[model samples]
Target: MIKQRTLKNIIRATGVGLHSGEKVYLTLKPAPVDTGIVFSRTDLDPVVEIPARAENVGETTMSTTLVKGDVKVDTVEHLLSAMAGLGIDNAYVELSASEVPIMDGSAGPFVFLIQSAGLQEQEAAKKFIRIKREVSVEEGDKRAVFVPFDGFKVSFEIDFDHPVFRGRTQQASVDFSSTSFVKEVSRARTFGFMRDIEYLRSQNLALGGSVENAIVVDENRVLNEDGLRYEDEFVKHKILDAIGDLYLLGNSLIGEFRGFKSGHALNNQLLRTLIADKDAWEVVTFEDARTAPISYMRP
Candidate 1:
C-alpha cells in the first residue's frame, strides 16, 4: 500500500524569522500515522499545538499564519511546501518562534532538512483529497481552482506587469507525477520590489529579507548578484507557495490546481470552499504503491 511517512530522526535548524527578524529554532520529529502536520509553539511555557490545516489559518498577508486562540504562528509556507514536495504525510514541527525561518527564502533548505533526517514509511495507508469536480474562488482578477485530475497537477500564472517578468516562462504547469519538485521548483526564492522594503519594515514585515534569501528587484533591473535561479523563478516561487499552501489540507491532493494572480489569501479561500462542498472532493487511498501519484523520493 502507499504508506504514510515521517522523519526517521528528529532534525533541527536555527535561522531568522522572515517577519519577526528574531532568531528562531525549529525541530522536526516523527509523528504517529494520521497525526498530520502539527505545529507546536515550544517558546510558550505551556506549549501551544496548532494543526497546520486550512481551517486554522488566520492570516495570509505575505505568509500563511496559523492561530489557536491567542497563540499564532507565522510564515509556515516554505517548510510546509518542502514537506509536501517530499511526500511527508505526518510530522510534529516544534518551533521557538512564531514564524518559520525564511531559509534562503525557498523550500530547498527545508527539503534538505527532511532529506537529512530521512523518511520512514508507516504501516498505515496514505490519504489524498481527490477532487471530484471543479471548485474555485475568485477575487477581482485573482483566482484559484481545483479540477478533477488523476494526479497532482499545478498550473499558475503571475501578472506583476514588471519588465523582469515579461517572459514566456511567466506561466508554469507542473504534473507532480512527472515533475521533480526538488530540481524544478524548490529553490525558487520569494521575490519583492525594492520600493516596498521600507514600508514593509515600518509595518514590521519582511524585516529579515535580503538578497541572500530573496530576489530583490529594482524598477529598472534585478539587484541580486547572481540574477535568477530559474528563468521563470517568480512564477515557480508562486507554484512553490501554492504547493505549501495547499498542503494545509493535511494530505496530498489528487487533483489539478490552477491559479492566476493568486496569493496566500486566495489559496486558503479556495481550500475552504472546496472543503465546504462535500460533492467537490473525497478522501482516497491506494492499495498499491504504484497506484500513488506521488513517491517519497523525488527524481
Candidate 2:
C-alpha cells in the first residue's frame, strides 16, 4: 500500500522570524500516522497545540496563520510547503516564537531539514482527498479552483504590473507526480516591492526581511544582486504558496489546482468550500503502492 510517512528522527534549527524579528528555535519530531501537521507553541507555559488545518487558519495578510484560543503561529506556508513538497504526512512542529523562522524566504531550508532527519514509512495507509468535481472561489479579479485529476497538478498566473515582471513569464504550472519540487519550486523566494518595506516595518511586519531572505525589487529594477532564481520565480513562488496553503486540508489532494492572482485567503476559502460540499471530494486510499500517483510511491 501507499504508506503514511513521517520524520525518522527529531530535527532542530534556529533563525529569525520574518514578521516578529524575534529569534525562534524550531523542532521537528515524528508523529504517528494520521497526526497530520500539528504546531506547538513551546514558549507557552501550557503549550498550545494548533493543528495546521484550514479551519484553524485565522489570518492571511502577508502569510498564513493558524490560531487556537489566544495563541497563533504566523508565516507558516513556507515550512508547510516544504513538508508537502516532501510528502510528509505526520509531524510535530515545535516553535519558540509566534512566527516560524523565514529561512531564505523559501522552503529550501525546511526541505534540507527533512532530508537530514530522513523519512519513515508507517504501516498504515496514506489517505488522499481526491477531487470528484469542480470547486472554486473568487473575489474581484482573483480566483482559485480545483478540478478532478488523476494526480496533483498546479497552475498559477500572476498579474503584477511592475517593470521587473513585465516581459517575464507570468504563468507557471507543475505536474507534481513527475516534478522534483526541491529542485524546481523550493528555492523560489517570496518577493515584494522596495517602496513597501518602510510601511511594512512601521506596521510591525517584515521586520526581519532582507535581500538575503527575499527578492526585493525597486521601481525600475530588481534590487537583489543575484537577480532571479528561475526566470519566472514569481509565478513559481505563487505555485509553491498554493501547494502549502492547500496542504492545510490535512491530507494530500489528488486534483488540479488553478489560480489567478490568488493568495492565502482565497486558497483557504477554496479549501473550506471543497470540504463543506461532501460530494465534491472523497477520501481515497491505494491498496497497492503501484496504483498510487508516482510522486506518492516509494522511490
Candidate 3:
C-alpha cells in the first residue's frame, strides 16, 4: 500500500521573511503518522502550533496566511508547495518569525532542503482527496478549476499586458509517474508589476521584496539584471502557488488544476469551495505505486 512519508532527519535553514523583513530560522522535524503539517511559532511567549489546513487560513491578500487565534504564518505557499510536490504527509515546521523565508522567491530552496534531509516512509497509508466532480471559483478576471483526474495535474495561463511579459503562457501535466517537480516547477520565481510594489509597501507588505527575490516587470522592460528563467515563468509560478495552496486541504489532491490569471486568493477560494461541498471530493488512501514518486530524489 502507498504509505505516508516525512523527513528522515530534522533539517534547518535561515533567511529573511518576505513581508516581515526579519531574519528568520526554520526547522523541519518529522511528525508521527496522521500528525499533519503544523506550523509552530517559537518566538511567541507560548508557542503556537497552527495546523496547516484550509479551515485555518485567515488571509490571502498578498500570500496565503494561516492563523490560529493570535498566532499566524504568512507567505507559506512556496514551502507548502515544495512539501506537496515532494509528497510529504507529516511534518512540524518551527519558525522564529511570523512569515516563512522567501528563498529566491521560489520553491527550489525548500525542495533542496527537504531532499537533503531525505524522506522516510511511515507505517500509515498516504491519504488523498480525490475529486469526484468539478469545482471552480472566480475573482475579477482570474479563475481556477478543479476537475476529476487519476493523479495530480496542473495548468496555468498568465496575461501581463506589458511588452516584456505579454503572450507568456505554459501548461504542464504530470501523472506522478515521470514528472520532476524540482526542475519543472520549483524554480519558477514569483513575479510582480512595478506599479503594485509601491501600493504593497504602503500596506506594510513586501518589505523584503526586490529584483533579487522576484521578477519585476515595468511597462516596457524587466527590471532584474537577470532576465526570465523561462519564457512562461510567470504562469509556471502560478501553478507552483496553486500546488502549495491546495495543500491546505491537509492531503494531496488527486485531480487536475486549471488556472487563468489566478493568484493565491482565487486558489485558496477554489479549495475552500471544493471542501464546502460534500459530493465534490472524498479522502482515500493509496499504496505506493512502482512508477509513482518518480521525482522523489530528482533535483
Candidate 4:
C-alpha cells in the first residue's frame, strides 16, 4: 500500500510577502507520520505551531491566514499548493515572518525547493478525504463546490468584467498522476487591479505587490511589459489558489472542485461546512487494488 511522504532534508528560501511587502524567510523540514503539515512562527516569542487545517484558518480576505492564539501566518496559498501538488503528507514549515514570501507570485520556486530537498515516504498509510455528496458555498454571485470523484479534479471560471478580462473563461482538469504542476499551474502569477492598489495600501495590504512579482492589470491593459504567461492565466491562478485552500482539509481530497469567481472566503466557508456535516465526507485509505490506481502512491 501507498504511504505518507515528507521531505528527507530541510530546505530554505527567501522572498517578499505579497501583502506585507516585507522580506521573509521560509524553511521546510521533515515531520513524523500523522503529524500533518504544521507552520511555525519563528518570530513569535513562544513559537506557535499552527497545523495546516481548516479549523485553524482565521482570515480569508485577500489570502488564506491561519492563526493559533496570538500568532498568525498569512499568504500561505502558494506553498500549500506546492505541497498538495507534490502529494506531501507531513511537513514542518518555519517562517521568519507572519506572511510567506510571494516568490515570483507563483508556486514554482517553492516546488523547485521541495524537489531539491527530496521526498521520503513513511510507513503509515496515506489518508484521503473522499466526498460522498455535493457540498457548496455561495456568496452573492460567487460560488464553490465539492462533489464526489474517484480522483482530484478542479474546474474554475473567473469574471473580471474589465476590458482586459471581460468575457474570459477558461477551464482545465488535473489528474495528479499525469499533471506537471510546475509547468502548468505553478508559473501562473497572481494578478491584481491597478485601481485597487491604493485602497489596499490604505488598509495595510498588498504592500509588496508589483509588476515584478504579479501581473498588474489596468482598466484597458496589462501593465507588465511582458504580458501574461498564458492568455488564460488569470482563471488558472484561481484554480491554483483553490487547490491550495482545499488542501487545508489536512489530507488530499479525492473529489471534484468547481468554482466560479470564488475567493479565499468562499473556499474556507465550503471547507467549514464540509467539516461540520458528517455526511459530506469520510476519511479513508485506499486498500483495494482497483482504488489503488487513484491513490497518491509515489513521491
The TM-scores of all predictions, comma-separated, are: 0.97, 0.97, 0.94, 0.95
Clashing residue pair totals per candidate (backbone < 3 A): 0, 0, 4, 0
Q: 17-116, model 2: which lDDT tens digit per residue?
A: 8888899999999999899999999999899999999999998988999999879999999999998888899999999999999989989899998888
Tell me the lDDT of candidate 1. Answer: 0.91
State the weakest 10-residue window (summed lDDT) of model 2.
290-299
Q: Between candidates 2 and 3, name the one with more favorable TM-score.
A: 2
Where is the poorest 10-residue window by lDDT in model 3?
290-299
What TM value does model 1 have? 0.97
Residue pairs with colliding backbones in model 4 are none
Candidate 3 TM-score to native: 0.94
Runs in model 2 with CA error above 4 Å?
A: 297-299
- How far off is model 3, as Cα RMSD? 2.1
Q: Residue-wise lDDT of candidate 1 within 183-202, one digit each (tens)?
A: 99999999889889878977
Alpha-carbon RMSD of each model: 1.3, 1.1, 2.1, 1.7
Query: Model 3, which residues run further than 4 Å from truth?
Result: 168-178, 288-299
Q: What is the model-wide C-alpha lDDT for candidate 4?
A: 0.86
